[PDB]
Structures are given as structure tokens and as C-alpha cells.
Amino acid sequence: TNEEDDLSVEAEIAHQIAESFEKKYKFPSRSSGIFLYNFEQLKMNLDDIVKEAKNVPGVTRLAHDGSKLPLRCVLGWVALANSKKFQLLVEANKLNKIMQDDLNRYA
Numbered sequence: 001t002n003e004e005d006d007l008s009v010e011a012e013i014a015h016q017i018a019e020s021f022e023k024k025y026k027f028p029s030r031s032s033g034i035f036l037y038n039f040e041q042l043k044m045n046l047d048d049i050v051k052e053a054k055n056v057p058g059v060t061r062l063a064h065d066g067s068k069l070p071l072r073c074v075l076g077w078v079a080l081a082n083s084k085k086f087q088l089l090v091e092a093n094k095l096n097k098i099m100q101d102d103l104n105r106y107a
Contacts, residue, residue, distance in 0.1 A: 005064065012063040013050050016071065025072040027086075028094040035089055039075055042083055052078045058103050070102040 017039055024036040042049060054060050056077045062069050076099055079086035 009054070009060055009063040010050055012066055013053050013059065013069070014046075016063075016069050017049060017053065017074075018046075020071050023071075025075050027072075027076055027089075028091045028098065029089060030091045032091075037075060037079060037086060039078075041085075042075075042079060044078075044082060049078060052081060055081075056103075058107060062106060067106075070106045073099045073102045073106075 021039045024038050026034050027037055029035045039049060044052075053074045056074050059069060059074060076086075076090075076095055080090065080092070080095065
């Protein structure tokens with residue numbers, strides 16, 4: 001019934017991820033350090049990345065309004081859910097704090 005919303009949301013998310021597909025975002029390593037990761041390392045179909053990004057709380061709403069997305073948070077959520085390398089490299093506790101901080105910063 002509301003296909004127009006799902007189409008506009010998917011294209012807004014697809015647009016922002018394609019634009020920043022190679023950008024190196026910073027994530028907490030288990031050694032208190034920092035490690036870098038981008039969407040290109042997810043080794044996932046481009047459609048699937050956008051599908052997963054739609055599950056991140058607050059993203060689909062931000063995409064409906066055409067606002068800038070917290071892509072570091074989206075990348076971290078998608079990788080944590082899909083990438084075993086990312087999981088084994090990240091400190092999940094501080095990641096959730098950062099994702100919650102950047103998801104409360106945005107809205």
C-alpha cells in the first residue's frame with residue numbers, strides 16, 4: 001500500500017551508503033585501540049546491506065526525512081550482525097555505547 005515510502009527510503013539509504021562505500025570508519029578494538037572498516041569490507045550484496053541497514057533503530061525514519069544518516073553506526077550494526085572478522089575484532093560493549101551515542105546524537 002505504501003510502496004512509495006519503501007522505495008524512497010531504500011533509495012535514500014542506497015544513495016548515502018554508495019556515496020561513503022569506501023570511507024574508513026573508526027571502531028573500538030578489544031585492545032582499547034582503534035581499527036578501521038568500511039562497507040566494502042562487508043563482502044555482502046549491495047541490496048542486502050541496504051536491507052540490513054533498514055533494521056538499525058532510527059535509520060528508516062531518518063531516511064524518510066532525507067536527513068544525513070549516522071553511517072559509522074549503520075556500518076557497525078551491519079558488520080556486527082554479518083561479519084565474523086568485525087565481531088572478533090571489536091569491543092562489543094564500547095561499540096554499543098558509541099552506537100547509542102551516535103544514534104541519540106542523530107534523530
